[PDB]
Amino acid sequence: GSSGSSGMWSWDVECDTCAICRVQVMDACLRCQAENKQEDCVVVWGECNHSFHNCCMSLWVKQNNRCPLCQQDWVVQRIGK
Ligand SMILES: [Zn+2]
Ligand SMILES: [Zn+2]
Ligand SMILES: [Zn+2]
After folding, report:
1. CA distances for 1 relative to 4, 6, 7, angstroms
2. CA–CA separation, 81 vs 46, rounded Å?
3. Which of these, 50, 54, 53, lies nearest to 73 by C-alpha position?
4. Binding residues for Zn(2+) 2, per the UniProt record?
5. Where are the domains of the chain?
6. From ligand 2's centre to the CA of 13, what distance in Å?
7. Number of the ligand closest to the Cα of 25
8. 53 assigned ligand-binding residue
9. Rounded Cα distance, 64 and 81, in Å
10. 3-state SS record for the chain
């Protein structure tokens, strides 16, 4: 007897993700998850209503001081989990 059928499609329910590293802004980035610095990898919200990785952003502004989502004047609104 042959085998059944498999293959589960995916959706785009995952949004508002740190484009800098392309990692769940809620969780630690690939740079913090490997170094185990999650506790430090916090979420930084901007005036443009865009959450990012306090660690990434800091490194992003080094090259582009503009939100990689709306390329708008990045303004650290609030920081925290
Ligand atoms: Zn990131
Ligand atoms: Zn990080
Ligand atoms: Zn933005």
Report:
1. 9, 16, 19
2. 14
3. 50
4. 48, 50, 67, 70
5. 1-81
6. 22
7. 1
8. yes
9. 24
10. CCCCCCCCCCCCCCCCCECCCCECCCCCCCCHHHHCCCCCCCEEEECCCCEEEHHHHHHHCCCCCECCCCCCECCEEEEEC
18 in Cβ contact with 32 (< 8 Å): no
Q: Which residues pair with 80 in a beta bridge?
A: 43
Which residues lie closer than 8 Å to 81 by C-beta, 6 or more apart?
42, 43
Amino acid at 30: L
70 assigned binding-site residue: yes
**CA neighbours within 13 Å on the CB side: how many for 10?**
3
CA proximity to 27, closest of 41, 10, 11:
41
Q: From ligand 2's centre to the CA of 56, what distance in Å? A: 6
